[PDB]
Amino acid sequence: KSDVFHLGLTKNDLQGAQLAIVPGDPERVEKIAALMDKPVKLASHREFTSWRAELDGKAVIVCSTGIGGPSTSIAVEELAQLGIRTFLRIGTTGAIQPHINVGDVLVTTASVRLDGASLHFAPMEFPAVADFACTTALVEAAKSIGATTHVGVTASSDTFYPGQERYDTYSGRVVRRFKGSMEEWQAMGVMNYEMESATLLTMCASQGLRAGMVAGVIVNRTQQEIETMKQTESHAVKIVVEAARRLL
Amino acid sequence: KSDVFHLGLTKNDLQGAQLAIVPGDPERVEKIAALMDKPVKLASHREFTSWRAELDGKAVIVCSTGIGGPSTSIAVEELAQLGIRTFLRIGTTGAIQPHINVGDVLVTTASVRLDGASLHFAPMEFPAVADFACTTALVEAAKSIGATTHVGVTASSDTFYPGQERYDTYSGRVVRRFKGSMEEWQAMGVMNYEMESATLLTMCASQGLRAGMVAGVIVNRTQTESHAVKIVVEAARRLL
Amino acid sequence: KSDVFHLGLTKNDLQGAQLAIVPGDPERVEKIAALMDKPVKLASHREFTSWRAELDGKAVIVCSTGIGGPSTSIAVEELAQLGIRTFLRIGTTGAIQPHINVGDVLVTTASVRLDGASLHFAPMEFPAVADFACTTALVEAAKSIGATTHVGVTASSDTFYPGQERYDTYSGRVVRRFKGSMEEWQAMGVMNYEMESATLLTMCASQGLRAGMVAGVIVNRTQMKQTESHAVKIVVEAARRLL
Amino acid sequence: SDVFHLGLTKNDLQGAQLAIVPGDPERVEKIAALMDKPVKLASHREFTSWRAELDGKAVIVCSTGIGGPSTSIAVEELAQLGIRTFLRIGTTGAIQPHINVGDVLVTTASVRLDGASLHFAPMEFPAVADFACTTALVEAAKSIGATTHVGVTASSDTFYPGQERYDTYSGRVVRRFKGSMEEWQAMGVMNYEMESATLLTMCASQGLRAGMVAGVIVNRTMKQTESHAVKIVVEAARRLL
Amino acid sequence: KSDVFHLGLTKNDLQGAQLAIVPGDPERVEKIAALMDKPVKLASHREFTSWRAELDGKAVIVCSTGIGGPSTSIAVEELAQLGIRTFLRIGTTGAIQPHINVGDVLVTTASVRLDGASLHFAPMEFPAVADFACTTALVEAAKSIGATTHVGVTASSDTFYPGQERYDTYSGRVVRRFKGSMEEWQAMGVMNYEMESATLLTMCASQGLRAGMVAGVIVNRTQQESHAVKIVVEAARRLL
Amino acid sequence: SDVFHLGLTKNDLQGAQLAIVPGDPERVEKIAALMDKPVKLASHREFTSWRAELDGKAVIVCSTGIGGPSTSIAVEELAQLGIRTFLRIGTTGAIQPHINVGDVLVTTASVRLDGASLHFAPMEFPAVADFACTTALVEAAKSIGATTHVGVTASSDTFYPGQERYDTYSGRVVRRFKGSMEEWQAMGVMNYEMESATLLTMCASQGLRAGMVAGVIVNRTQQEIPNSHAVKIVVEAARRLL
Ligand SMILES: O=c1ccn2c(n1)O[C@H]1[C@H](O)[C@@H](CO)O[C@H]12
Ligand SMILES: O=c1ccn2c(n1)O[C@H]1[C@H](O)[C@@H](CO)O[C@H]12
Ligand SMILES: O=c1ccn2c(n1)O[C@H]1[C@H](O)[C@@H](CO)O[C@H]12
Ligand SMILES: [K+]
Ligand SMILES: [K+]
Ligand SMILES: [K+]
């Protein structure tokens, strides 16, 4: 039984859930669900692993998106079909501002659209903006947890390498568009790079769905040295769960 | 006399002000200022009328932007040069959603960039996004006075006519880009049209400046002013 | 009682006028109208100050546009609704060519579209070109009073600062698009920057309206009252030929 | 030869600084024959060049072939040889109902529906004709008494889909061009041709003077009109020497 | 225990492998590997499941890409870092031509770039073109195995839904860019939709890596709404 | 005439469904002369056309002139007349250091630095050659043992700035093309010419088969401008596609 093409889920599986937490990694799904009550694995197909748990007595979904806008768009669309109206992405990220430290938490108000999938939902002029209630819940939850928090703009790239201006690659070249791009984003106050939010935020904001994004800073592109990255993971994970409580 | 090319203001005129309320219309400037302590006229040059006031013992600027991104970009830049770090735009607006009514208050989280000036600060991929603290202050101020408030996306157009898909014009034509565009924005949940936010929000978000926007709905495309005005002043109070 | 949303004007106020002189600054409107017969103030709303005057017995309008394409597009549209078919922009301007000196007069044949409002009327492919009759009248008017005239392309920018590649700013930053752009326009023979012509010329050329532009060189970044009056006489003299 | 395509040297031009540039190589001699001392210089590919004399001054007539790409080659190489003024004389399909077959169209600027113009200036730059050239063409058309329209021309890299012709092998027009002719008509565009956007953009952005005149061969809504526009371009050339 | 960030693989793990077969689905990796000599599981991290096998005495990698250009670009880059120089994608696909049947095999010569990741390697002007030797090996392999084969252009979309003009979605809205797009690709002779080839082909063709693309038709859109695997393995034999 | 520019009727083709399309009008006769019963058909503007016979089948040779625009006219009108397969035979500037003058380059697909291709398909559509045509060209090349390279070609609307030549009147290259040759080179692009982007796009998007082959006349790593192997190959490839 499945109501959707990819996820292998039915509306019954959701038990009336209307909020989903959407990490990138299928392996993080169980870990996030473990922060809630009565978590049960629902399905695992391709990069889409899903669990249901209870939060303050209400059903909540945790479902992985895989890496990138394309797989993210599938998860979000199919979750929406199933009844999800609110999406919270939780990630781990590399900061590009020297003042943003490993262990810090980043809440994304909106994203630089360095992706392709967002364009499948809205023209480039449209902002990849987070829902206000979601952003509020994340900011507030970060205060409840105790994190050092930065709130602002994230660059959301379709690649891990040239789109984030990495030169440590097979070709060692970066196409003209992205040459000198990291310095530009830095100067514009962009906090970090990741790979899913442009798609998530655009597709939700343009379709009457609520979306927020929080991430833990595990590395800094400007710093030479590369605590536990699982400690920063757990901080961000606790925040997304606490935020979800306020959006139910 | 002036530390800036257009505004006719010095840093001294601001008296340490770091926040400016920025209406479009010079006429609205004094009225906004009058809701605060010790309001005084500063200068008037072209579409840039500026007043100073005080909230909770802190200096606040009110300065008009004129219509559109170009004049807004001038005002925001020169205010930034003089020490303004937080900008709160206040406008009146026409809603494009069936369930956004006249007398409603709109708080803009981000704008569709249907302008040219925003591109002079950041490429199109960059979001014309409002500052979270500003958006928070505006939403909370709106709730504190019991206004019917909608929070979300605004379409910000370089024109009043074709860019907002108006056909009641000299030519009666709308360029291909904008034909059917209102229905598209509507389907995407865009609240309203105005003409300055894409520029304001992009230029601030990409230059380490805080910006927010609130507007009063006075008409639907499918008393009010003084309520939006009360909201922007109360929001400013929370951001000093 | 107004027929249009912003200008506060009726068709009757124009008294059959079909040409408008469109300066940027409301404060310059009377000064221009004062060079013609029977100058009367019509209205003043926002940046749109309008006067009516009379030239060779025909009614003419002088109306300010404010700064930038957006406000210009409002003034032009609403003036067209009221019957205006010919628009003559007058400005004062800097220059980006070293051979162009303060005192010189610039007549614009077409503009580099560094604005956004022009795109609301025609796709970028469409030329921001001046009307031939208006340009002819302006060039001939400049010759009649013996002004040193440069005829060519103007870069029309939605910003005063980064789009004209100014670095003396709060951020000191210019976006990639405009980094090295002034040198590029200079090498392409562009005369100057201003902020309204791309919108004016495109919206008129694509809607059967006639537009032209003249400007006095007051400053040169590469390198004012006398130049002002020169440009104003030219635009008024050109208007006579176009009535 | 001093140049790669045209097969010409600086001396072949004998001090010439103006070139009349038709599209068709076969039209070159005809135009040259209207002036004094017409002499064939060279013929390579679509580039046939003649020299002639106008009021004692050497003038070049050189074909461009069809399209911006070959036009850009001819213009560049002539510029290398010393040409500073270029006058295009062409054939055109009018798209305005009031413009009759046989009429003369003087182009102030072009809608850039080409690719070559972008190799000289970004799309924001106007494909605008030189004022002196345009003035000379208009004044020449008046002296000949020709029915003349002055304005904007759509300049297309294709004869078929870019001019929204459906009478084709596929009968398909790509989205960009579907409904485009009506759009250009509403915007007051006079006509279609295939070289002006490149010519005007490359000249205006490089300090070269260019003008564009054409005779109407079809209305998108016979023998005498060619010579009519040809007479105009030669008369205009006289005013630009 | 890993020379690359995401795959969890070391250069040692590859055993001299220079060719990788790259399916979308992690769960298909073992199946493909099983068709060859000495299949050994290497790693499984995120959507990246990798096996090593042997084909005519030579080491060959099978590694999943996950869905979409972004995850594909990571797999290809890190596999290239470990020494892979030839990539053969084996996928599933929806045909958009009436004459192409379910169960048919499609060899892609080049792709319509309806993706974003390809632009991170080459501007849009650059063709998302397959390697000639890889395409030849696939066509030749198809003759060998015996399948109804179509060779041509593929539309490669960053989405499963709006980019493939699907309307049975939550919003039922397809953005302007993609309204009527399927009929357009159909008239242009495009065979099919999938989601990875534009990224794969562009990133390889612009980086001196060889890439080929083959897929089995699982649905025909003009109605709704193992051959291919044998062919990719046989093609790999011809390319070692 | 059945078509506006070429001056040809379907009868002139004698059932030909394949055309060999050089850029230069003066090359048409030379190509035709390598086949049986060569007959001149017409010469209008840059479009010179001949008919010939290959293995008892009629073949057209027709010049395109330089550039996408005139190419698009020739291909379209030939298509109207019944041509379904087009083989471009051109000259080219190599941008890779180890490609020799005289080498034969077979194009798999083109970088669309042209304008005409966009009149047939949006930029995301690949300017890709037909597989059968490309195969025939490669296999003809090995049959005569010519030094051959197969891969991507940059196809430009200009000879000068779009191919980043600086020895020009202005000596300037617009921002878009500054540093472009190094970029294409790094991307493994073999060569520059001016027609293939248009040809390949317009054919691949309209159910017409196209192949592209060119002889190297200059190596751009060394010089901008120079101080019948490819022709044999295109004729031999044509035999295989009849
Ligand atoms: O609709 C038309 C009519 C005439 N011309 C045209 N388009 O382009 C010009 C060409 O060079 C050429 C192509 O036929 O002739 C010009
Ligand atoms: O219409 C289709 C049919 C199959 N596939 C597709 N689009 O994209 C490929 C994906 O990786 C994936 C997504 O379902 O499967 C492939
Ligand atoms: O650098 C080059 C060398 C040869 N060719 C070229 N560029 O474009 C092709 C043209 O049609 C024409 C222009 O010279 O010949 C081809
Ligand atoms: K994925
Ligand atoms: K203004
Ligand atoms: K040509």
* DSSP string over A93-119: EEE-STTPPTT-EEEEEEEEEESSGGG
Q: Which residues contact B224 (CB under 8 A, 6 or more apart)?
A: B92, B102, B103, B216, B217, B218
- Distance between Cα E165 and ligand 2 center (Å): 13
DSSP E48: E
Cα F73 to Cα D60: distance, rounded to the nearest angstrom: 28
Please answer yes or no on whether C110 and D109 come within 8 Å at the CB atom.
yes
For the record, the structure tokens of D132 come out as: 């002196």
H or E stretch at D34: none
Active site residue F5: yes
Q: Tokens 């139910």 label which residue? A: A248
Q: Burial, E185: exposed, middle or buried (Cβ in 10 Å; 0-12, 13-18, 19+)?
A: buried
For the record, the structure tokens of D16 come out as: 């010439």
Q: Which of F76, F77, F164, F236 is catalytic?
A: F77
Phi, psi of A125 (to 5 degrees): -60, -30
E173 touches chain B (CB under 8 A): yes
How many residues belong to chain F?
242
The whole-angstrom distance between residue A164's C-alpha and the CA centroid of its chain comes to 17
Enumerate neighbours of E (3 or more CB pairs within 8 A).
Answer: A, B, D, F
Q: What is the dihedral of CA A133, A137, A138, A140, to 10 degrees?
A: 130
Q: Which residues contact A67 (CB under 8 A, 6 or more apart)?
A: A24, A47, A160, A195, A196, E6, E46, E47, E66, E68, E70, E71, E74
Q: How far is CA B41 from CA A195, B29, B52, in A?
A: 49, 9, 6
CA end-to-end distance (rounded Å), chain B: 26
Give, in degrees to the nearest 5, the angle at Cα D126 between D125 and D129: 135
Residue F111's DSSP bridge partners are F154
Which candidate, D218, D183, D186, D195, places its Cα nearest to that of D110?
Answer: D195
Q: How far is CA E53 from CA B159, E58, E65, in A?
A: 63, 8, 18
For the record, the structure tokens of F14 come out as: 């004698």
- Distance between Cα E213 and ligand 2 center (Å): 13
For the record, the structure tokens of A57 come out as: 């007595």
Phi, psi of B160 (to 5 degrees): -85, -30
Indicate the domain borders of chain D: 1-241
Which candidate, A88, A135, A129, A92, places its Cα nearest to that of A240?
Answer: A88
Active site residue F84: no
Phi, psi of E150 (to 5 degrees): -120, 135
For the record, the structure tokens of B222 come out as: 């499918």
Which candidate, F71, F12, F14, places its Cα nearest to that of F42?
Answer: F12
CA end-to-end distance (rounded Å), chain A: 27
Q: How far is CA C49 from CA B46, C23, C52, C66, C103, in A?
A: 11, 10, 10, 9, 27
B72 neighbors B117 (Cβ within 8 angstroms): yes
DSSP D176: G
How many residues belong to chain A?
248
Please answer yes or no on whether D194 and F69 come within 8 Å at the CB atom.
yes
User: Which ligand is located closest to the Cα atom of residue F5?
Assistant: 1
CA distance C168 to chain A (A): 16
CB < 8 Å to F152, chain E: 126-127, 129, 205
B180 touches chain E (CB under 8 A): yes
B202 neighbors B118 (Cβ within 8 angstroms): yes
A192 neighbors A96 (Cβ within 8 angstroms): yes
Q: Tell how many helices (H) and how many strands (E) occur in chain E.
A: 7, 10
- Distance between Cα F92 and ligand 3 center (Å): 5
Q: Burial, F132: exposed, middle or buried (Cβ in 10 Å; 0-12, 13-18, 19+)?
A: middle
Instruction: Name the E strands within chain A.
Output: 19-23, 37-45, 48-55, 58-63, 86-95, 105-114, 128-129, 149-157, 192-194, 210-220
* DSSP string over F155-223: EES-SSGGGT---SSS----GGGTTHHHHHHHTT--EEESSHHHHHHHHHTTT-EEEEEEEEEEETTT-
Phi, psi of D36 (to 5 degrees): -75, 150
Q: Which one of E107, E112, E152 has the shortest CB-CB distance to F125? A: E112
E73 touches chain A (CB under 8 A): yes
User: Which ligand is located closest to the Cα atom of residue E24?
Assistant: 2
DSSP D132: H
Cα B91 to Cα B25: distance, rounded to the nearest angstrom: 9
Phi, psi of A244 (to 5 degrees): -55, -35
Please report, as a single letter, which amino acid is at residue D13.
L
- Distance between Cα D195 and ligand 1 center (Å): 8
Give the right CATH number for B1-240 from 3.30.465.10, 3.40.50.150, 3.30.420.10, 3.40.50.1580. Answer: 3.40.50.1580
Q: Which residues contact C99 (CB under 8 A, 6 or more apart)?
A: none
Q: What is the dihedral of CA F164, F166, F171, F176, to 10 degrees?
A: 10
A113 touches chain B (CB under 8 A): yes
Q: Which residues of D are catalytic?
A: 5, 77, 165, 220
Please report, as a single letter, which amino acid is at residue C71.
S
CA end-to-end distance (rounded Å), chain C: 28
If one looks up domain F1-242 in CATH, what number appears? 3.40.50.1580
Resolution in A: 1.9
Which candidate, A117, A109, A130, places its Cα nearest to that of A196?
Answer: A117
Cα C186 to Cα E219: distance, rounded to the nearest angstrom: 57
DSSP F115: S
CA of D84: which chain F residue's CA is closest?
A: F169
For the record, the structure tokens of B67 come out as: 């219509």
Cα B192 to Cα D49: distance, rounded to the nearest angstrom: 61
Q: Which one of A109, A125, A208 has the shortest CB-CB distance to B112? A: A125
D76 neighbors F160 (Cβ within 8 angstroms): yes
DSSP D177: G
Give exposure, D12-29, as e/b (b: 16+ Cβ within 10 Å): bbeebbbbbbbbbbebbe
Q: Is E67 in the pocket of ligand 2 (CB under 6 A)?
A: yes
Active site residue F220: yes
For the record, the structure tokens of D188 come out as: 């007051």
Q: Which residues contact E224 (CB under 8 A, 6 or more apart)?
A: none
Q: Which one of C66, C77, C163 has the shortest CB-CB distance to B161? A: C77
A88 neighbors A138 (Cβ within 8 angstroms): yes
Q: Indicate which of D119, D167, D201 best probes the interface with F, i.e. most F CBs within 10 Å of its own CB.
A: D119
Residue F109's DSSP bridge partners are F128, F152
Q: Tokens 């157009």 label which residue? A: B157
D101, D114, D159, best to mutate for ligand 1 pocket (most atoms within 8 Å of CB) = D159
C1-243 classified as CATH 2.60.300.12: no
User: C105-114 and A149-157 as β-strands: parallel, antiparallel, unpaired?
Assistant: unpaired
Q: Which residues contact A146 (CB under 8 A, 6 or more apart)?
A: none
D223 touches chain E (CB under 8 A): no
Residue E43's DSSP bridge partners are E50
**What class has domain A1-248?**
alpha beta
The count of other CB atoms within 10 Å of the CB of residue A38 is 10
Which candidate, E111, D16, B39, places its Cα nearest to that of B31?
Answer: B39
The atom number, within ligand 1, closest to the CA of D65 reads 11
Largest CA distance in chain F: 52
Phi, psi of F137 (to 5 degrees): -65, -45
Q: Which method was it determined by? A: X-ray
Q: How far is CA E190 from CA A21, A116, D233, E151, in A?
A: 37, 20, 48, 10
Cα E93 to Cα B47: distance, rounded to the nearest angstrom: 59
F164 touches chain D (CB under 8 A): no
Residue E16's DSSP bridge partners are none
CB < 8 Å to F183, chain A: 175-176
DSSP C72: H
For the record, the structure tokens of B209 come out as: 């400046």
Q: Burial, F158: exposed, middle or buried (Cβ in 10 Å; 0-12, 13-18, 19+)?
A: buried
For the record, the structure tokens of A70 come out as: 């394309």
The whole-angstrom distance between residue D83's C-alpha and the CA centroid of its chain comes to 15
Which candidate, B200, B155, B201, places its Cα nearest to that of B181?
Answer: B155
Q: Indicate which of A31, A67, A74, A221 best probes the interface with E, i.e. most E CBs within 10 Å of its own CB.
A: A67
User: B149-157 and A210-220 as β-strands: parallel, antiparallel, unpaired?
Assistant: unpaired
Q: Burial, B47: exposed, middle or buried (Cβ in 10 Å; 0-12, 13-18, 19+)?
A: buried
B127 neighbors A128 (Cβ within 8 angstroms): yes
Q: Which residues of C are catalytic?
A: 6, 78, 166, 221
Cα D47 to Cα D43: distance, rounded to the nearest angstrom: 6
Phi, psi of D40 (to 5 degrees): -70, 130
The whole-angstrom distance between residue B209's C-alpha and the CA centroid of its chain comes to 14
Q: Which residues contact B135 (CB under 8 A, 6 or more apart)?
A: A132, B107, B108, B109, B151, B212
Torsional sign, CA B100, B105, B107, B111: positive
A184 touches chain C (CB under 8 A): yes
Cα C122 to Cα C128: distance, rounded to the nearest angstrom: 9
Judging contact as 3 or more Cβ pairs under 8 Å, the answer for A and E is yes
How many residues belong to chain D?
241
Cα A222 to Cα F177: distance, rounded to the nearest angstrom: 32
User: Which ligand is located closest to the Cα atom of residue D157?
Assistant: 1
Q: How far is CA C14 from CA C7, C83, C124, F93, in A?
A: 12, 8, 33, 64
H or E stretch at D233: helix D224-239
C120 neighbors C53 (Cβ within 8 angstroms): no
Q: Burial, B155: exposed, middle or buried (Cβ in 10 Å; 0-12, 13-18, 19+)?
A: buried
Largest CA distance in chain B: 53
- What residues have a C-beta under 5 A from ligand 4, the ion? A 66-68, 71; E 66-68, 71
Which candidate, F78, F85, F86, places its Cα nearest to that of F13?
Answer: F78
3-state SS record for chain B: CCCCCCCCCCHHHHCCCCEEEEECCHHHHHHHHCCCEEEEEEEEECCEEEEEEEECCEEEEEECCCCCHHHHHHHHHHHHHCCCCEEEEEEEEEECCCCCCCCCEEEEEEEEEECCHHHHCCCCCCCEECCHHHHHHHHHHHHHCCCCEEEEEEEEECCCCHHHCCCCCCCCCCCHHHCCHHHHHHHCCCCEEECCHHHHHHHHHCCCCEEEEEEEEEEECCCHHHHHHHHHHHHHHCCC
Cα E120 to Cα A114: distance, rounded to the nearest angstrom: 9
CA distance C165 to chain F (A): 16
Give, in degrees to the nearest 5, the angle at Cα A230 between A40 and A61: 25
Task: Give the up-direction half-sphere exposure of residue D20: CA atoms within 13 A in the CB hemisphere.
Answer: 36
Q: Which residues contact B215 (CB under 8 A, 6 or more apart)?
A: B90, B91, B92, B93, B105, B106, B108, B154, B192, B194, B228
The third-level CATH classification (topology) of the domain covering D1-241 is Rossmann fold (3.40.50)
Which candidate, C129, F186, D126, E52, places its Cα nearest to that of A173?
Answer: F186
Cα D127 to Cα D110: distance, rounded to the nearest angstrom: 5
B73 touches chain C (CB under 8 A): yes
Please answer yes or no on whether C176 and A184 come within 8 Å at the CB atom.
yes
- Distance between Cα D159 and ligand 1 center (Å): 7
Cα D47 to Cα D23: distance, rounded to the nearest angstrom: 9
B18 neighbors B88 (Cβ within 8 angstroms): no
Q: How far is CA C168 from CA B46, B78, B205, C160, C165, in A?
A: 22, 11, 19, 11, 9
CA distance D110 to chain F (A): 15
Give, in degrees to the nearest 5, the angle at Cα F44 between D67 and D120: 10
